[model samples]
Target: AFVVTDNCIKCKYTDCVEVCPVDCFYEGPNFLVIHPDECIDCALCEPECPAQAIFSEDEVPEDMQEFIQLNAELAEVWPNITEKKDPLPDAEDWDGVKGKLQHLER
Candidate 1:
């Protein structure tokens, strides 16, 4: 499963969601997470994340700790795949963003 790390906090790009074949991504207040069970382990979303926040479970850095539980818990309530092309709410507002995650608390 791919874990969403601290780098994703508030980036809100959702391009990763757009490209996921299984729609495993779950939107959150500050970040997005992948459903561990739903993810096909394809790694497609990794490149889409502008924050470069997605990593395999084994690849997560030690300090970006809570993502393991966050991904698993968020997955339980995330929407199932229905639409493939919905634009994220703040797409244009965040394009080419840099260091946006710095302001988030977690």
Candidate 2:
């Protein structure tokens, strides 16, 4: 499964949602997470994300390893979002911001 990391915390770009073969992405206030159990291990969403936020579970950077579980936990509670939605107004500015986990909303 692909994991949505910090770069996605405040960006919430939905290109991944559009490309996911299984429609496994779940939406939050300013982020999107992938449902680990529902994902088919399709790599489509990884490249589609402009934020370059999606990483394979095995390849998820050590710093973002928590996102693997974060994705799963959030997906269970957030709404399943398959269609592309407008990203946050400041998505471009937030795309590469560091320590964005502090801003993640439930």
Candidate 3:
């Protein structure tokens, strides 16, 4: 399964969701997470993320590993979202910024 990384914290682009065959994405206040159990390891959602936030489980960045856990936990509580929608208002400004994990809403 692909992991949604820290770059997605505030960017929250839904392009990945649009291409996901399993519709396994879940939404939070300022993030989008992939449900580990539901992901089919299809890899379709990887390049679709505008923030380049999605990563395969084995290839997750060294610094972004915690997001694997974050995605796992959040997807259980966040509502499932299958449609593409506008990202956070400050998405562009926040993309690529570091240390976004501290800002995670929950």
What TM value does model 3 have?
A: 0.96
Write one digit per residue (lDDT tens) for candidate 1, span 1-106: 9888766665566678777888788776556778898889999888887767889888988876667887798778755542344445665565445554455443
Clashing pairs in 1: none
**TM-score of each prediction:** 0.73, 0.97, 0.96
CA error at residue 86 for candidate 2, angstroms = 1.1
List model 2 lDDT by residue over 1-106, tens digit each.
8889999878988988777778898989988998999989879988999999999999999988889998999999999998998889999999899999999988
Residue lDDT tens for model 3, 1-106? 8899999988897999888989999999888999999999999999889899899999998988888998999999999999999888989999989999889896
Candidate 1 segments exceeding 4 Å error: 78-106
Off by over 4 Å in 2: none
Tell how far residue 51 is off in model 1, in angstroms. Answer: 0.5
Worst lDDT 10-window in candidate 1: 79-88
lDDT for each candidate structure = 0.71, 0.89, 0.91
lDDT of model 2 at residue 22?
83
